[PDB]
Amino acid sequence: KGEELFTGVVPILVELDGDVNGHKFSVSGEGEGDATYGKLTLKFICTTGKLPVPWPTLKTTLVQCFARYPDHMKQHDFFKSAMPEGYVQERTIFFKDDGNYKTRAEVKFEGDTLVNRIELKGIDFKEDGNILGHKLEYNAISGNVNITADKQKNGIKANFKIRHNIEDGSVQLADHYQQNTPIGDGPVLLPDNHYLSTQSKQSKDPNEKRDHMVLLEFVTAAGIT
């Protein structure tokens, strides 16, 4: 039943409240997802002024229900199966030689809109590290989300690495651990091991003077032949 809600273009809303080393900020995002093509287009705005961390570090936090699951893998799509009641998505993101983000999000339909509502808490950051020092490039992010069933929670777990380019040519590693739990009581699809091949490009709206990020993202399930 969940999978039927994604056969067309779906409007997306993202709302994030954050506190990173006591820097409090909010982010509002809008756009649309077409799961048939694994395609997401979004624009995010910092509504509190200047974002106190680099946009790239927030990208993974700011809707894996928009993944293109190949037909032969459709029985492994936990994300859409939880809809419309939705799922809780939790992460710890460990920035190597720096702080961590912990995130708790509720992803669900509000009428015909897919909504991602997030709380983000960041601690242990260095004031002149790559995050609070704003030393990261703004360009593109890709990786493979490794998913396994979590039957004890009627949900999934995932892990993956992101390598953020630093302006010196080096990389800032962000190790991600993830847990998803259904909000509702409907049955969900507990998957075999597989991965999401995910890539996005970050850009700027030439007309936009607010602190913002434009994103074009493609997400495809794989790793079952």
> Taking the CA of residue 116 as centre, how many other CA atoms within 13 Å lie in the half-sphere pointing to its CB?
29
Assess contact for 63 and 40: CB atoms under 8 A.
Answer: yes
Structure token digits, residue 37 = 């093509």
Q: In whole angstroms, give the CA distance from residue 49 to residue 25.
A: 8
Minimum CB–partner distance for residue 169 and Ca ion (Å): 5
Per partner kind, with CB cut-offs from 5 to 8 A, the member of Na ion, Ca ion, none near residue 16 is: none
Binding mask 144-163 for Na ion (x = CB under 5 A): --------------------
CA nearest neighbour of 85 among 181, 178, 150, 196: 181
Nearest residue to Na ion on Cβ basis: 36
Tell me which of 35, 141, 156, 219 binds Na ion, using CB under 5 A: 35
**Is 54 a residue that touches Ca ion (CB under 5 A)?**
yes
Q: Which of residues 112-171 bind Ca ion (CB under 5 A)?
A: 138, 169
Minimum CB–partner distance for residue 27 and Ca ion (Å): 12
Assess contact for 88 and 157: CB atoms under 8 A.
Answer: no
Residue numbers at the binding site for Na ion (CB under 5 A):
34-36
Residue numbers at the binding site for Ca ion (CB under 5 A):
54-55, 138, 169
